[PDB]
Amino acid sequence: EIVLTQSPGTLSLSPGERATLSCRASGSTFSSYTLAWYQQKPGQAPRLLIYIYSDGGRTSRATGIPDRFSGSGSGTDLTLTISRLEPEDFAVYYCNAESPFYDYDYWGKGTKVEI
């Protein structure tokens, strides 16, 4: 198994401020997975933001993303950084690791980012 730990648990910030979230992998971090940050605006489907290959080495942003989203780490530690909160960025943010073969898919517990 793998454990993901999102940190922080909540975030009470306000427009313009910076937000830095981080996902920690532990357990069998020496397999192949993809570590991804997803955003989930309420009432909407998750959205891939950034991701990185567990064993393969640079991060990528998804298609159609503003610059306010950045990723940094090796792939046992993704950090999503939204630099300057715009209004709609107040959402719930999740990370998962996923085997390319889908024999394992693990999700964090969530990081709520509100005002």
Numbering used by the authors: 1 to 115
The paper states:
In this study, through rational design and phage display-based screening, we generated a novel class of recombinant light-chain single-domain antibodies named VHHLs and identified two promising candidates, L6 and L15, which demonstrated specific binding to mCD16 and favorable biophysical properties. Unlike conventional sdAbs derived from heavy chains, light-chain sdAbs represent a novel class of antibody domain that utilizes the variable region of the human light chain for antigen recognition. In summary, we established a light chain engineering approach that combines CDR3-grafting with site-directed mutagenesis of CDR1 and CDR2, providing a rational foundation for the subsequent development of VHHLs with antigen-binding ability. To validate the human light chain engineering strategy established above, mouse CD16 (mCD16) was selected as the target antigen. mCD16 is widely expressed on immune cells, including natural killer cells, neutrophils, polymorphonuclear leukocytes, monocytes, and macrophages and serves as a critical target in bsAb.
The results showed that L6 bound to mCD16 with a relatively high affinity, with an equilibrium dissociation constant (KD) of 54.3 ± 1.41 nM. The final refined model exhibited high stereochemical quality, with an Rwork/Rfree of 27.7%/32.6% and a RMSD of 0.2 Å for bond lengths and 0.57° for bond angles. The structure revealed that L6 adopts a typical immunoglobulin variable domain fold, comprising seven β-strands arranged in a β-sheet core, with three CDRs extending outward to form an antigen-binding surface. Notably, the electron density maps showed clear and continuous density for all three CDR loops, indicating high confidence in loop placement and conformational assignment. The resulting RMSD of 0.853 Å indicates minimal backbone perturbation despite extensive CDR sequence modifications. Unlike conventional antibodies or camelid VHHs, which often present CDRs in a staggered or turret-like configuration, L6 exhibits a distinctive hook-shaped topology in which all three CDR loops project co-planarly from the β-sandwich framework. This geometry effectively creates a broad, contiguous paratope surface that may enhance the antibody’s capacity to engage with flat or groove-like epitopes, such as those found on the surface of membrane receptors like mCD16.
